[PDB]
Amino acid sequence: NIPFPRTSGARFCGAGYLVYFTRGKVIIQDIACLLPVHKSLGELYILNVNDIQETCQKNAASALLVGRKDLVQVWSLATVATDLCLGPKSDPDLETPWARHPFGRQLLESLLAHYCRLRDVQTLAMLCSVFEERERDQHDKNKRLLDPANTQQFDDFKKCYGEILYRWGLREKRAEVLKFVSCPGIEFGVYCSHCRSEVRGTQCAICKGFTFQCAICHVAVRGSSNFCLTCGHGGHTSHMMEWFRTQEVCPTGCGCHCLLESTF
């Protein structure tokens, strides 16, 4: 049992390519005008939690550089629908929430259903991110523009767009997008400078003191740090930016050429 050998094939590779061959040489296509995602928009789009208004306008401007009539109108509506003057209140018997207004949840759920049919992940992921006693509990569910019974689909949208962004080659943007998801071995320990014991954390337990002391400015380090695996003399990252820029020896009189024994 063995089929007959084949002499042609075609596969979709990368995120915007097409490879094929025929009965030989192999050609490579750049067919990126037939997919609903655009690579330039993924390089121009921004996300910034501290100021929603600016992001919507910047993305609306960026949508005009590509010539998509749809996105300009959508991002325009997003600005007015996500203003800070429409904040929900705490008591149900004080106002009707903007979510129940027919320009709230129902318009969002009509854009999302439109873009789903087009398979446009890139807009769904962005939209789902920008918008992110019994009576009191019911109110909290009622006052949200995204249904609390559909979190899984939104997480799936964000995850798939992140995988695409990894495929294209952009690393920072994937982290930016993934920062909005609702659902969230061997390590290194520090030998304390007072009790001479391994300490799990920037602060000790016996003497409760600082466990790590920088090997350039001798000031205790509490945030970022780099260290050598062989000799083990570490400090702030910018300090070794400056130090290992030219020299190749331990800054603490150790003799260990850390540049060669650490960068595996």
């Binding site: 009539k69 109108q73 325009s76 509506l77 007015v80």
Partner: peptide
């Protein structure tokens, strides 16, 4: 206005 005049 956004809906009815581009």
């Amino acid at each position: 206005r956004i809906i009815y005049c581009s």
